[PDB]
C-alpha cells in the first residue's frame, strides 16, 4: 500500500537522472589531453 | 592550432642548419626548464636581472649568438655575459658549476637539447608573452 | 508527519530498489561518458576542440561583432579552420 | 523494505562520492586545465 | 567587612547598571584610552608618513578630510614591528609624524576587546547562565586581531595593518586582493557564505516568527504590544511556522525544535567568520588564494583565458599602482 | 546523558577506557610521524633543496644533525629511514595497548589498582601524575642536550664556512642570558624568545628547562596544592582539559612566529628563507647587480629622497632601502659578513662580496615564502610554472589555525567547566532563576 | 464544482512537495534556470562572446566556469532561440550567449514563481505573509543587478556572468569603474548584511545560553517540545545580561524578531537602489572638494586619492581583455605604473 510513481517520484528523477549523466560526462573529461 | 613540425623546427647553429624536435622533446624541455630554470626564468624573463630576457631577438644579439641549439647548449655548459667578456659559471647554473648548482648535476646532453629547444620554440607559440612580463600576462 | 509516499529509508534499503538502480545508475554514467568520449558534446554545443580555438598562425579572437550577421560570422570563423 | 542495512548503503555511497571527487581533483593536475 | 572584600564585592556586583568585573578592570581603562586617542586623532592629527617614504598622508578632519575619507593612519614602515610608545619619541611632533597614535589605539583596543569577551563569560557566571555567548563574539574579535595584529606580524609592519578609517578600509581590501587574491581563497568564500547566510537566516527567522504571531492586538495598535516582557507562554506558534516552512520547501528541511534552530542560527555565521578571520591570518603568511593564471592552453600552447585571467588583469592594475613611490625592486615581496 | 556527537564525554569517569583513548591516539601521532617521514623519504631527491620539495619532517631531522654535512648538503639518507621506521613500528605497540584498554581492558582502573586509578577531584593524585609527566618532559629536554653535547651535535647554520654539524661544548648557563630572553619584548628588533640566534643558548636553555621540569616533578609529587591554589581553580576533568587547551594554544602561536622569523633552529638551508630574509636578499641582489655596472650604491638617491639601495634605520644603522626598510632586524649568515658597527659597511659592500653570497641572495629572493593554495610560487599575479610553497608558509599557517581553534576550545571548555561545577551547565532552574531574585537595574 | 475547482483540489494537495497554482510558474522556470546553468558550465564556451574558456569540457574548474553574457554586439537582444540572431539554430544560439538570457529570464520568472508560492502556502496554512515580503529583498537585488544594470549600459555584456570567478570579476569592475565602495547605498547594504549576520549569531547565541533546564541530559536539545506553551529560554535573564554587558537590550520578543526581518531586508533594498544609479553611470565616484585641493596642492594626499590611483590601474590593465569588442591597444608606455612594479 505505497504508490511507486508519485509527484515526489517525478521531482526526484527530474534531478537525479541528469545529475548522474552529467557526472559521467564530467568524469570522461578528466582524461582529455591537449 | 597545434604543435606542428614547422613550430618544432628551430635553428641548430649559426651556419643555418635547422632541427625539428618532437613533441616528446618539447614537453621534456618544458619540464626540465621548470625543474632547473623557471624559478628565475618563468615566462622567459629573468627575475634577478630583468634587463636580460630569453626572447629569441635578445639571444641573437648575445656574443656567442644564443638563438640556436648549439649556442644554448654551450651556454648551459660555460655561460658568459652578454658580450662574451667574462664567464659567469660561479653565479649562474651550468654543468661547469654543478658542484655549486646541484640541480644541473643529473642533466644529460639530450636534456640540454630539449631545454634549449623549449626556449627556442616557446616564443613561436606565445609571441610577446614570452619574455614580456606582467604587461602581457 | 507523513503524506503517503513511501519513506526514503524504506526504499533505498529495499532489494527491488537496488536491483533496478544498479543498472540505471551506471548506464546513465556510461551514457554521459560516451556523450564526451564520442566527441558528440563538442558538436552539439559548438564548443571548440583544443585544436580549433585559433587557426595555426592566428592570435586574434574570433569575436562576434554583429547582431544580425552573428550566425554567419561564427560560420565564417569555423570555415577559416576547415 | 529494509533488507540492505542503511549504514552499508551509506558507506558505499560515501566512498562513491570520494572516488568521483578525487578523480576530479586528479584531473586538475592532468590534461586540460593543468597549466601543462 | 574588610576593605578589600568590599571592593571585590563591588567589582563583581550584579547590581551595577553596567557590570564591571575583573575583566572590566582592564577593559574600562584601555577602551577609554583607545577611544579618547581615536577621537582626537580623527579630528586633529597631522599627516602621517605611513609608508616610511617621507610622503605623509592626511587623515584628520582639520587637515582636509571628511567622514568618509578620514582615518587614523597606520604607523610608519620605517618603524616596522617595533614598539613605538610616546616615551620612545623625541617629541610628540615626531610621534605624530610617524603614526604613533595608531599603535596606541590598536593595542589598547585589542586588549579592551579581549577583556570584553572575558567580561561576557564573567557576567554569565554571576547570573547562572550557560557560558558560551563569548564564544560567538570570538569570531569578530578574531577578525579584528587578523587585520590589526596578525597580518602586520606576517608582513613585518604595522604600516600594512588596516587603517582606522572608511576609505582606509577600502585601500586595505584592494591591496589585499592584489597581493593575495583573497577572492579566490576558500576561507574568504566561506566567510561570504557565513555573512550572506547569516543575513538570509536572520531574515528567515525574523519573518517566520513575525508570520506566526498569535493574535493579541487590534489593528489600531502595534502587534508588539501583544507581548509583555517576562510572560511565560511563547508569543508565536512554532507549529504553524514549521507547517508553513516545511511546505515552502519540504517537511524535513524545516526545524520544529527551537533549540536546534537557534543553535543553527548561532553556528552558521560564527563558523563562517572564524574561517574568514583565519583566511586573513593565514594569508598573513602568504598562503594565497587559488592561482589559475594560464591554467588553460590549447593544443599548440596558446593561453586560453578564463575568468581567472581577467581577475588577474584587474589584480595587476592594483599591484602596479599601490604605494606608487615605495618600491625600488621588481618584486613586492612583503 | 551525552549525545553521540559529544560521545567522548562519556569517558570522563571511565579511567580505563579513557586510558585506551589516550594511548590509541598517541599511536596515531607516532604513526603519522612514521608514515610521513617515509613518504617524504621516498619522494626525496637530494639534488633539490629540501624546501623545493614540500618537506617538513626531513628538515626537523636534518636540524638535529643527522644525514647532513657542510652547507646542509644531504650526505646520508639512512638516518631518515630509521626515524620513520622506528616511529612506524612503535605505533603498533601504542595502537595495541590503546584498543586493548578501550575495548577489552578494565572499564575503570581504580578497582583494579589504587596506583593507576584516579579521581579527578583528588588534588593530590592529580599533582602526582602531573609530576611524573613533568619528569618525563624534563628527561625529554635533556635528550636534546645529550645529542648536542655527546652524540654528534646539531646543524649550525652560523658555523663558519657555510654551515655544518657542530658539537656543543659550552652551552650557555648564565641565567642572565637564558632568562634574559624571557624578558625581551616581543616587538620588532627584540622578538622575545624567537630571537635566539646560536646553539649555545639553545642547548643551555634546555639544561635549565630540563632541570626545572625535574625539579617541578618531585615538587608536585611531594606536595598538594596550597589553599590559595585550591580556592582559585576548578577541580574537574573538563577544567584540567581546558587549562591545557589554553597552553597548547599559546604554544601554537609561538611556534607560528618561530618558524616564520627564526632562521637558527629552522635553518634556511632546509626550510627556505624567511619572509624578512627573502626581502633583504632581493635588495642585496640588485645592489650587487647595479654596482657591478658602475652604480655607486652609497650615494644613489631614490625617487623619494631616501637612498635607493641604502638608508638609515630610525636609530641610525645603515640598512637596505626600499620597502625592505621594515626588515632591517633580519640577521642571516650570508649577510652578517657585511655588517660593521654602524650596520652595513659600505667598504665591505664595495670590495668583499663573494660569489657564494650572490648565489645565496639570488636563491633566497626567488624562493620567498609567497605562493598560492594550489602551490603556484610567487606573487598572486604570477603565471603558472613554478610549483612551490615555502615550508615556512605551510608550517606557519597550519599551526596558526590549530592554535586559534584550541583557544576556542579553551573558552568552550573553561566556561562549561565553570558552569558545570556551579551546577547550571544544563540551563536555568525555572523555580530558582537568579535574576528573578535580584533587584531591578532601574 | 467544475474543472477549475477540480484542478484547484489537485494542485493544493498535501504531498511531499507542495505544487499549487504557483507551481505551474515556479517549477518549470526554476528547473530550467538551474538546468541551463549546469548545462552551460559543463559544455558551453565563451570563446565567441568573450574570448574565454568557461566550461568543464574546456578545462575549467568549479571556480572558473560560467555561463557568460552575450557579445556586446547583441545589445539588449532577448536572444530568443527562434529569434533573428540565432534563427532557430541551437548550436549557434549557445555560441552567441543565448543561455545567458535563457537563465536570466527564466530565473526572473522563477523568483516570481517562488514568491507567489510563499503567498500561496501562507494563505492555505493561515499565517501572515511576512516571509514573502522579506523575499522582496532578494528579488530587488536580482533585478537591479542582472536586468536593470545592463539595460542602462550598452548591452547585456556588462551584466554579471553566472559563475564564481566571473562574479569576482564583476566586483572588481565595479571598484575600478564605478568606485562602488564609496557609494553610501552600498555602505547601507553592507551594514544590513553584516548587521544581519551579527543579529543572527547574537540571537542564536543568547537563546542557547539563557535556556531553561527542562530535562536532565547534558544535551539540551532533547528538552524542548514543539507544542509546549512555555518559552524555552529566559527573556528576563537575557535582558539583564545584555543591559549590563552592552547598555541596552531587547525587552520585546516581537520587536526583536521583526528587527531581524527589517535589518537585512532594508540593507539589500538600499544596495539595489545604488545599482540602479550605476546603471546610468550615476556614481558617487569623487568628492569635488578633494580633487580641487589635490589638483592645486601636490602635497595633499588622502586614502581617497590613493584609492583612485588603484581604480585607474584596474581600468587600464583589465579593459583590453575585459572589453575585447573595443579593440583597446595600450602600448606599454601608456600604462599607469608606480615605481619598479
Ligand atoms: C597568559 C595570557 C597572555 C597575556 C599576555 C599579555 C601581553 C602579551 C603581548 C603579546 C603581543 C605580541 C605582539 C607580537 C609582536 C611581534 O613582533 O610578534 C612576533 C614576535 C617575533 O618577533 C620578531 O622576532 C625577530 C627575531 O628574529 C631575529 O633573530 C632570528 C634568529 O634566528 C633571525 O636571525 C632573524 O633574522 C632576526 O630578526 C625579530 O626580532 C623581528 O624584528 C621581530 O618582529 O614573536 C613573539 O615574540 C612570539 C610571541 C608572539 C605570539 C603572539 C602572537 C599574537 C597571537 C594573537 C592571537 C590572538 C588570536 C585572536 C584571539 C581571539
Ligand atoms: C569528498 C572528498 C572528501 C575529502 C574532502 C576534505 C575537504 C578538505 C580536503 C580537500 C580534499 C582534496 C585534497 C586532495 C587534493 C590535494 O590536497 O592535493 C594536493 C597534494 C597532492 O598534489 C600534489 O600537490 C603538490 C603541492 O606542492 C608541494 O609539492 C611541490 C612538488 O614537490 C612543491 O614541493 C611545493 O612547494 C609543495 O607545496 C604538487 O602540486 C604536486 O604536483 C601535486 O601532485 O596533496 C596534499 O598535499 C595532501 C595534503 C594532505 C594534508 C593537508 C595538509 C594541508 C595542511 C596545511 C594547510 C593548513 C591550512 C591552511 C588553511 C588555508
Ligand atoms: C585535546 C583536545 C580536545 C579534547 C580532548 C576535547 C574533548 C571533548 N570535547 Mg572539545 N574541543 C576542542 C578540543 C578538544 N576537545 C577544540 C579545539 C574545540 C574547538 C574547535 C572544541 C570544541 C568542542 C565543542 C563545541 C564541544 C566539545 C565537546 C567535547 C567532549 C565530547 C567530544 C566528542 O565526542 O567529539 C566527537 C567528535 C566529533 C563529533 C567529530 C568532529 C569532527 C570535526 C569537527 C571535523 C574534523 C574534520 C577535519 C577538520 C578534516 C576532515 C577531512 C575529511 C577527509 C574528513 C570531549 C570531552 C562537547 C562537550 O562540551 O562535551 C562536554 C561539545 O559540545 N568540544
Ligand atoms: C582518536 C579518536 C577516538 C578514540 C581513540 C575514541 C575512543 C573511544 N570512544 Mg570515541 N569518538 C570519536 C573518536 C575517538 N573515540 C569520534 C570522532 C566520535 C564521533 C563519531 C566518537 C564517538 C563516540 C561515542 C558516541 C562513544 C565513543 C566511545 C568511545 C570508547 C569506547 C568505544 C567502543 O567500545 O567502541 C566499540 C567499537 C568497536 C568494537 C568497533 C571496532 C573499533 C576498533 C577499536 C577499530 C580499531 C581499528 C584498528 C586498525 C585496530 C588495530 C589493532 C592492531 C593495532 C592490533 C573509546 C575509548 C563510547 C564510550 O565512551 O563508551 C562508554 C561511546 O559511547 N566515542
Ligand atoms: C599539520 C601540519 C601539516 C603541514 C604543515 C603539512 C604540509 C604539507 N604537506 Mg602534509 N599532511 C598532514 C599534515 C600537515 N601537512 C597530515 C595530517 C597528513 C595525512 C593526511 C598529510 C599528508 C600529506 C601528503 C600525502 C602529502 C602532504 C604534502 C604536504 C605539502 C603540500 C600540502 C598541500 O598542497 O596542501 C593542500 C591544501 C589542503 C589539502 C588544504 C586543507 C584544508 C583543511 C581541510 C582545512 C582545515 C580545517 C580545520 C583543521 C606541505 C609541505 C604533499 C607533499 O608535497 O609531500 C611531500 C603530499 O603529497 N602531506
Ligand atoms: C602511559 C600509558 C599506559 C598506562 C598508564 C597503562 C596502565 C596500565 N596498563 Mg597498559 N599498556 C600500555 C600503556 C599504558 N598502560 C601500552 C603502550 C601497552 C601495549 C604494550 C599496554 C598493554 C597492557 C596490557 C596487555 C595490560 C595492561 C595493564 C595495565 C595496568 C597495570 C600494568 C602494570 O602492572 O604494569 C606493568 C609494568 C611493566 C611491565 C613495566 C613497563 C615499563 C616500560 C617498558 C618502560 C617505559 C616505555 C617507554 C616510555 C617507551 C619505550 C621506548 C621506546 C620509545 C623506544 C595499568 C592500569 C594490564 C591490565 O590492566 O590488565 C588487567 C594488562 O593486562 N596494559
Ligand atoms: C605543566 C606544568 C605545570 C603545571 C600545570 C603546574 C601546576 C601547578 N603548580 Mg607547579 N611547577 C611546575 C610546573 C607546573 N605546575 C614546575 C616545572 C615547577 C618548578 C619551578 C613548579 C613549581 C611550583 C611551585 C613552587 C608551586 C606550584 C604550584 C602549582 C599549582 C598552582 C599553579 C598556579 O597558581 O598557577 C597560577 C600562576 C600564577 C598565579 C602566577 C603567574 C606568574 C607568571 C610567571 C606570569 C607570566 C606572564 C606571561 C603572560 C607569560 C609569559 C612568560 C613570562 C614569565 C615572561 C598548580 C597545580 C603551587 C602549589 O600549590 O604547589 C603545590 C606552588 O606553590 N608549582
Ligand atoms: C637564478 C638563480 C637563475 C637560474 C636558476 C637560471 N638563470 Fe639563466 N640567467 C640568470 C641571470 C641573473 C642571467 C643574466 C646573467 C648575466 O649577467 O648575463 C641569466 C642569463 C641567462 C641566459 C642568457 C640570456 C640572454 O639574453 O643572453 C640564458 C640563455 C639563460 N640564463 C638560461 C638559463 C637556463 C637554460 C636555465 C636552466 C638551466 C637558467 N638560465 C637558470 C639567472 C638564472
Ligand atoms: C579505540 C577506538 C577508535 C580508535 C582506534 C585507534 C586510534 C587505533 C590505533 C591503532 C593504531 C595507531 C594502529 C597502528 C598500527 C601500526 C601497525 C600495524 C604497524 C605496522 C608496520 C609495518 C608492518 C611496517 C612494515 C615496514 C617496514 C618494517 C619497513 C619499511 C616498509 C614497511 C613500512 C612495509 C575508533 C575511533 C576508530 C573507534 C572507537 C574506538
Ligand atoms: C628551552 C629554551 C630556552 C629557555 C626557555 C625557558 C627558560 C622558558 C621558561 C618559561 C616559563 C618559566 C614560563 C612560564 C609561564 C607562565 C605562565 C604562562 C603563566 C600562566 C598564568 C595563568 C594562566 C594564571 C591565571 C590565573 C590568574 C591570572 C588569576 C587567578 C586565576 C588564574 C590562576 C586562572 C631559551 C628561550 C633560553 C632558548 C631556547 C630553548
Ligand atoms: C538548457 C536547456 C534545456 C534544459 C536542460 C536541463 C533541464 C538540464 C539539466 C541538467 C542537470 C540537472 C544537470 C545536473 C548536473 C549535476 C551535477 C554535475 C552535479 C554535480 C555535483 C557534485 C560534484 C557534488 C559533489 C559533492 C560535493 C562536492 C561535496 C558534498 C557532497 C557532494 C556529493 C554533494 C532544454 C532541454 C529545456 C532546452 C533548452 C536548453
Ligand atoms: O602591498 Mn604591496 O606589499 Ca604589503 O608592502 Mn609591499 O607593497 Mn607595501 O606597504 Mn603597504 O603594501
Ligand atoms: Cl596604496
Ligand atoms: Cl622595494
Ligand atoms: Fe528566535
Author numbering:
A (entry chain F): 12 to 45
B (entry chain V): 1 to 137
C (entry chain E): 3 to 84
D (entry chain J): 5 to 40
E (entry chain A): 11 to 344
F (entry chain C): 32 to 473
G (entry chain D): 12 to 352
What do the study authors state?
The extra oxygen Ox, present in the S3 state, is lost upon S0 formation, indicating that Ox may participate in the O–O bond formation, and changes in its density probably inform on the onset of this process. Consistent with the high mobility observed for the W1 and W2 water ligands, the connection between D1-D170 and Ca appears to be weakened between 730 and 2,000 μs and is only fully restored at the S0 state (3F(200 ms)). From 1,200 to 4,000 μs, several structural changes occur, which are reversed upon formation of the stable S0 state (3F(200 ms)). These include the increase of the Yz–D1-H190, Ca–D1-E189 and Mn4–O5 distances, as well as a decrease of the Mn1–Mn4 and Mn1–Mn3 distances. Concomitantly, the amino acid coordination environment, the hydrogen bonding network around the OEC and the waters in the channels reset to the S0 state. This includes recovery of W20 in the O4 channel, which is proposed to be involved in proton release during the S0→S1 transition.
In natural photosynthesis, the light-driven splitting of water into electrons, protons and molecular oxygen forms the first step of the solar-to-chemical energy conversion process. The reaction takes place in photosystem II, where the Mn4CaO5 cluster first stores four oxidizing equivalents, the S0 to S4 intermediate states in the Kok cycle, sequentially generated by photochemical charge separations in the reaction center and then catalyzes the O–O bond formation chemistry. Here, we report room temperature snapshots by serial femtosecond X-ray crystallography to provide structural insights into the final reaction step of Kok’s photosynthetic water oxidation cycle, the S3→[S4]→S0 transition where O2 is formed and Kok’s water oxidation clock is reset. Our data reveal a complex sequence of events, which occur over micro- to milliseconds, comprising changes at the Mn4CaO5 cluster, its ligands and water pathways as well as controlled proton release through the hydrogen-bonding network of the Cl1 channel.
